[PDB]
Amino acid sequence: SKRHIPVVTDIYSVEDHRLEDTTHLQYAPGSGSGPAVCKKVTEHERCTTSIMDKLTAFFGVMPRGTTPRAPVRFPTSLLKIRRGLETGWAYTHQGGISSVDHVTCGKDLLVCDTMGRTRVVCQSNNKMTDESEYGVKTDSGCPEGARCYVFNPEAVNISGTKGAMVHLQKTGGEFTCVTASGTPAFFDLKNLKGWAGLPIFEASSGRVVGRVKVGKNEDSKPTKLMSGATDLTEMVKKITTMNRGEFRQITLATGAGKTTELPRSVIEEIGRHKRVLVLIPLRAAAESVYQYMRQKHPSIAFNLRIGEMKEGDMATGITYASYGYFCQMSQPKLRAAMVEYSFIFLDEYHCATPEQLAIMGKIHRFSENLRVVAMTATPAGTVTHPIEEFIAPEVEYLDIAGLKIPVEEMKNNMLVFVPTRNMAVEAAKKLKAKGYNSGYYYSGEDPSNLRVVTSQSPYVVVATNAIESGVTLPDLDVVVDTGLKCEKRIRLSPKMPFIVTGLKRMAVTIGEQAQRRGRVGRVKPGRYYRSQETPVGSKDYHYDLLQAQRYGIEDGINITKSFREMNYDWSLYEEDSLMITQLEILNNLLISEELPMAVKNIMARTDHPEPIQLAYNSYETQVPVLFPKIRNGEVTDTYDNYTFLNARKLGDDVPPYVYATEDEDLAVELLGLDWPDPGNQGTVEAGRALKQVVGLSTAENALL
Amino acid sequence: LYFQGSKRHIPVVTDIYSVEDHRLEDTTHLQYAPGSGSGPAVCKKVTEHERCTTSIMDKLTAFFGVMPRGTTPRAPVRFPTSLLKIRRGLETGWAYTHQGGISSVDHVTCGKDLLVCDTMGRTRVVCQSNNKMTDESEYGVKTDSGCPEGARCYVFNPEAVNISGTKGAMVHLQKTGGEFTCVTASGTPAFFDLKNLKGWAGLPIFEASSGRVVGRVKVGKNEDSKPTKLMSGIQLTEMVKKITTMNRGEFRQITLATGAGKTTELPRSVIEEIGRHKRVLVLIPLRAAAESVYQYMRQKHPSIAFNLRIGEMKEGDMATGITYASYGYFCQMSQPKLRAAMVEYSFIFLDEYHCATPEQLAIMGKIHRFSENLRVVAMTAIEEFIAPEVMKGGSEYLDIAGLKIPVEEMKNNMLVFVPTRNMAVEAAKKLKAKGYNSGYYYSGEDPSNLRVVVATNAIEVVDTGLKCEKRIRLSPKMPFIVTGLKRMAVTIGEQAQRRGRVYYRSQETPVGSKDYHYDLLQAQRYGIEDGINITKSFREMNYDWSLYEEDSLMITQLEILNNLLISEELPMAVKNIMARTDHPEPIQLAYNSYETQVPVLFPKIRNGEVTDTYDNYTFLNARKLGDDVPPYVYATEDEDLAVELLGLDWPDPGNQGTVEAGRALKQVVGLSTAENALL
């Protein structure tokens, strides 16, 4: 059925005919007459396609003996086309004849006229736009909102005569069906079959502005005639039609302006005085987008919330805020502030910051009152100039972070990704001892100390996978990837201490390796030296979730439970069901009794890296304990003296910790000591619950 | 149509495997992939594999619950000795041919006629017998023979893959008790993941020596150390220790037989173990039940303090003993006040949750919002004749509510359970017209008129097996919610209450779980003031607590609509009207207020036609329907019917809130919200 030759059966010559009222001419579906430069049929010629010609054209073969024909050797007319069993139209214009692709299939028109057996050659065809050109396209543009119409010389109007027109109105890239008065009209699309290919004329000018291609009907919308960046407009439509209690996940390229232009479009669509919130992890990131946006769009108000909480904030523009900003609020205050925003955008959720998981769970508790849109350039479980890919061997040449690299590339700009900061500094000074322009970068460093090193023709910077951003490399040539990183991980066991948190060196993510290779090739081609380390798939957020539990202590909220329910509705993060269950039991223990005031103040004032430790352990021990530091796998006589703890050294008496670190567990093991067992109903029940959860016994009773 | 669940699918036979007996001394190579012996058996060898020619339209029609028109019936004997593969919607099962006809499993066929599009054309095998208690569906008479204990059996799947990797694999069995135990060809106890056995139900089980049928593949069972088995059905001090060792944030479900003291001695034991001055709450649906148990308990255990909370809200209650309360008592509280009150109790006992009253579901979801702060324990608890139904056609028997009862039993005191009240009065006057001492009872009756002398379930033996309860329909066409009374089968527990009274029951089969959708809809009211989505809270609650069976689709739809209900603040006038009216479902006013502020009185329906009478409810300030149908979001079956009979039409959504709500309901069930035709 894709073989059929289109055959012109009727030719309707037409002339411009201005009428101030077209009511009697409209096609059967508040104020206005519908004045237009109508089309009047002056002649109706029937083509004389013979029986065999018709059947041959039906079976895809052009009848033998048809001569070509110029698309100008026609009267200004509308041509009825019958392709196999289907019906459509084409029309004449200065450039020739033009029709629709799904009507003609880009095939030559069979025209058996008074000029004989002829065929019009198809010069252009476009299936995406559904246009077919037998000549050069001459359709002129149309101003937005102008009234148009499409004329069918074979339809029956309200008056019951031959020749009916459907009035239109140009909106966006499509046309809207309206009556002669201008009321939005509805048409059953079956009542419009056989109209494709007809031209759309502007009412005032009587000039072609488009073709009849596709009909579309929405539930509450009137009938439309479609004509087939632009994706962002659809995104904004979907966002703005949201009802309170709905949630959308959006995947946007960073350059497409997920943080910048998307909220701007939304707020311009719903109203400049409506309140829209945009949550960003890093304070500096929120500040940057705030300055950039308020200087770029001076017509739209903006607000930045990264410092003290502004009580009773009702700021009208777009509010760029940090998650941690709202972590300063009690649960009822958080809800009262969140429901006042027309829309809430959760930015860069793929990052698992504790403030982020806490705020996401906490607001999901009242998600029924919110319109929530989560944005990322890279969702959960998503990897992301030409480039040479090298695989460097482990250890003419030189040694860079344990990899064999040829000395030639030391003439070029090199970025070496190394797991730890001690390794970063070590390799840095080892490289400067050999006579190279080396530097180092890790968490907490100033992006300016590197200015001295990067402002030179040859430089070699050794940095952690941490802070890929701040270093801003100029004209970077080669990257050396050790394939390793250093992240915090947690272990959960039914034996107290139930929680053990520590740094671990581990393989890099596949997508994160792609990010390390992403650095070179932006302005100039480059090369990569990669280890034989194989990447591992996914991100672990468990340590960050554990830390996020803190923001629920004052409100008595189980942040782990809130996260589980949130992720159930929103599907934003990969889940380890077992680990989430255990963490939820432990979090239940964490809020089981009011935190002592002394522990509260110590937690608020200390430079301890994981003050939640004090909270978990406070169910067994009131006195924090300083374990001896572990240097090179043995026990030392040094201690991490943190502020406000009023601690004691370990000695030979191991405290009954609920929460410990890998170095504390190691100190206990090396000292030949043992961890105490649970000492109250809370910790005993928590331990037996964790043990029951890790039940290897599976049993099932399924009706096959 | 669209997605409406899984109980509508028509079963369709897709393949027919004609088979013959095939004696083998060794069957090892044929076994299915999971001490001494070869496993000699009368196997089944596939002689023909005919593929059915069910057309696309037939397949989709059967998928949407309708039987394709133009199919002729077919005897279950006009088949080769064969195994029939069945596809009901998306699921797969089996049936088999035998002397008595065709036999299959209930959860595979649902007691529906089999659509069989064979070389014989469009045919149907009629289901003669159906049994949900067992796993039997009969297209004919069951002819399965017995089996001696411990005999070796097997089940053959002509499509499974054996150890040799060919089509047709068998699982060896051995009859133990009323079930079968899985073993290998040698006889070693075997293990099977039940997923590796899904789609095997309906296959026959054969005895090894005789090669004769002894049973069907119905249910799989797996225990920790036990081997895989094939079931033929779906299948105090310790309690107190487990309850009292609970940490805040834990939940326990307890099943206790009545009289063992689910409400009395369990909470009494718990509070006696934890301390007589600790506060324990016990929530009971009925106020009179709570008051009664309060009186009984405070008279029985005078050493323990007791409190009753069924009336006005006692603010800041710190009553030390056991507090018996109605759920509705705590429905008077805002969410923060509810939390403040609930966290002060050491334990909270949810009694008789199987009722699922609106107050019950509302309180359960609302408190589950802060379950992490709570310790929650949910608790739940003459000869039998089957009388035949009577038709339009008797001489020494008599007809009671559509049942054939012998006149002899009329010499005894009879209680007739009847679904509707009109049936109660009708059968009452027919029975007194025949010369009997008859009466009637239903909700609102005088307790003395019956003293002087057929009743609705509201009386809580001749059991019709039916009741009259409100049911709801959810559609993407506004009005999205339609609620009306419907006659329906009784639950198992309620039939047990009707048999509890002194038995002639109809051929009506009971249903396992109560339908709570209407009560959930009504329960949404208790979250309007707090701005809480009771449906969402219920879904999360039941996810954590696993207390009620769930219709995922219905819950999702109800959650979308409930989100619409809380989208904007309720108008003050609507709040006051809802508080003062005798309208039976005031949540209607709240839903409709998103389109219409003026309630509409629809004409009443008497005997299926439109009347000129109206239900004049208080405080509505309504208008008569007339010829102008309001754009209702929430309607009733009689309102929808009145619209249909009057030849009128329901309006479409008229604002972005209702339009988007409709678009969400359509997005569920996979309905296109836009259409794009090439003109």
UniProtKB/Swiss-Prot annotation, chain A:
Signal peptide range in chain numbering: none
Compartment annotation: Host cytoplasm
Domain Helicase ATP-binding intervals: 239-392
UniProt-annotated binding residues for ATP: 252-259
Site, as annotated: Cleavage: 696-697
Residues covered by the Helicase C-terminal domain: 402-603
Residues modified by glycosylation: 157, 558, 641
Active-site residues, as the UniProt record annotates them: 102 (charge relay system), 139 (charge relay system), 196 (charge relay system)
Stretches assigned to the Peptidase S31 domain: 34-207
Motif, DEAH box: chain positions: 347-350
Coiled-coil region: none
Catalytic activity: Leu is conserved at position P1 for all four cleavage sites. Alanine is found at position P1' of the NS4A-NS4B cleavage site, whereas serine is found at position P1' of the NS3-NS4A, NS4B-NS5A and NS5A-NS5B cleavage sites; a ribonucleoside 5'-triphosphate + H2O = a ribonucleoside 5'-diphosphate + phosphate + H(+); ATP + H2O = ADP + phosphate + H(+)
Entry function: Multifunctional protein that contains an N-terminal protease and a C-terminal helicase, playing essential roles in viral polyprotein processing and viral genome replication. The chymotrypsin-like serine protease activity utilizes NS4A as an essential cofactor and catalyzes the cleavage of the polyprotein leading to the release of NS4A, NS4B, NS5A, and NS5B. Plays a role in the inhibition of host NF-kappa-B activation by interacting with and inhibiting host TRAF6. Interacts with NS5B to enhance RNA-dependent RNA polymerase activity.
Assembly and binders: Interacts with host TRAF6; this interaction inhibits host NF-kappa-B pathway. Interacts with NS5B; this interaction enhances RNA-dependent RNA polymerase activity. Interacts with protein NS4A.
Name of the molecule in the record: Serine protease NS3
Taxonomic lineage: Viruses, Riboviria, Orthornavirae, Kitrinoviricota, Flasuviricetes
Residues of the full protein shown: 1590 to 2321 of 3898
Curated annotation (Swiss-Prot), chain B:
Subunit structure: Interacts with host TRAF6; this interaction inhibits host NF-kappa-B pathway. Interacts with NS5B; this interaction enhances RNA-dependent RNA polymerase activity. Interacts with protein NS4A.
Reaction(s) catalysed by this chain's protein: Leu is conserved at position P1 for all four cleavage sites. Alanine is found at position P1' of the NS4A-NS4B cleavage site, whereas serine is found at position P1' of the NS3-NS4A, NS4B-NS5A and NS5A-NS5B cleavage sites; a ribonucleoside 5'-triphosphate + H2O = a ribonucleoside 5'-diphosphate + phosphate + H(+); ATP + H2O = ADP + phosphate + H(+)
Protein name: Serine protease NS3
Domain Peptidase S31: 39-212
Active site (record annotation): 107, 144, 201
Sugar-modified residues: 162, 533, 616
Residue ranges occupied by any Helicase ATP-binding domain in the UniProt entry: 243-387
Organism: Classical swine fever virus (strain Alfort/Tuebingen) (CSFV)
Motif (DEAH box): 351-354
Subcellular location: Host cytoplasm
Site (Cleavage): 671-672
Binding locations of ATP: 256-263
Source organism, top-level taxon: Viruses
Role played: Multifunctional protein that contains an N-terminal protease and a C-terminal helicase, playing essential roles in viral polyprotein processing and viral genome replication. The chymotrypsin-like serine protease activity utilizes NS4A as an essential cofactor and catalyzes the cleavage of the polyprotein leading to the release of NS4A, NS4B, NS5A, and NS5B. Plays a role in the inhibition of host NF-kappa-B activation by interacting with and inhibiting host TRAF6. Interacts with NS5B to enhance RNA-dependent RNA polymerase activity.
Helicase C-terminal domain span: 402-578
